[PDB]
Amino acid sequence: GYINAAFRSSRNNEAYLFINDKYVLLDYAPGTSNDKVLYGPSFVRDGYKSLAKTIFGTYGIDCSFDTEYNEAFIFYENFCARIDYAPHSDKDKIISGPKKIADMFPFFKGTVFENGIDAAFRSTKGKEVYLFKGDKYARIDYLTNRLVQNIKSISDGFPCLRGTIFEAGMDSAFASHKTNEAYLFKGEYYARINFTPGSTNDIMGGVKKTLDYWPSLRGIIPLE
């Protein structure tokens, strides 16, 4: 019962985390340890009315990423959708979907990503997004719907992850408001990283226990 998906909000220093069929709105305070729950833990179906009579409302979200504006892609196994999350408001809507990952992102056809994606996060470069499944990762442009480069092993693109738990996969992720920094999650552990679009660079440097640094999540994970 750990974090399965997330995406950073348009509101500064804010992110949405998904656990089982629920979610929380956090002030994650990247340059601090005083992160706090702004909303939730709440059922996706209650907080997101537009998702209530859909599989996402029933089972939750297992992968996601923010695009731009108040929009983001959400996934649940084979299926995905593009929604307006309408932060600190009540007007969430579905824009595209629910449809299979293969119809939303054709280029994923025949790939390991077709039946589900483990995690993803918004890049700083153009409309680029990094996505992960197993020990593999993809780099796409969601605006033009293109695979920017070949699918590679995670370590090919993020070398600093070699030897760590993130080497073989990642349960969840989201991009920070601090430029070129992102957060990864797996088991009871998490990482904060500084990535470089198109380049191979390696930091940051303390795979940390999640609850020791995120106090706003005490009693929210594990959720079983």
Place this chain on the structure above:
Amino acid sequence: GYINAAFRSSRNNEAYLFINDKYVLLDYAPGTSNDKVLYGPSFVRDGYKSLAKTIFGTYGIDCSFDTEYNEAFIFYENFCARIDYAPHSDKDKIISGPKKIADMFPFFKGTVFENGIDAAFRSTKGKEVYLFKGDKYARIDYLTNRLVQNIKSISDGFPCLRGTIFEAGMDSAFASHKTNEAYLFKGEYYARINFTPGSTNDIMGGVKKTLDYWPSLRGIIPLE
């Protein structure tokens, strides 16, 4: 693009059939020539406002069956839902779901129905329903949620189909208003049969070209 699902309507001699992501309402006039179309072909997402933003609105219904009153279960791959189709009106709604077949019908877990059901039809006996997948068939009770008997080959429970093309599978089916008669479909063919609960019987003779006997379906199937 042939019929992939159907269910009997509470309204006399009326049945809904699903083709691709569309559907048609029909007076199928069992023992008469005035076999005609009442509504559609129309997109599911259009005819059913309650399904506009669901996977069913996107891909259609691949299997279903009426239960009691104005309700029916509809499926799409491993997912399903119980809806109130509100015959001849605007007021349709999702009653339960959508959830996985495994979660709506726990007894299907581990069986070949878990990830999808080909077709089904309501029995006249109690709250029982027959469902088909491949060359196997199931007999269940949807109120008490149980398999009434071990799943077995279609020919074992429906001997009259041995030899016929339905021996190995059914694209679709629905029960007739005339007692113990059901309609089965596969490709350009169909068959009207007389079944008897708790027994193994023939019959009704004549696997026929569907368009040959359903004047109202010309122009509708095959849907291309």
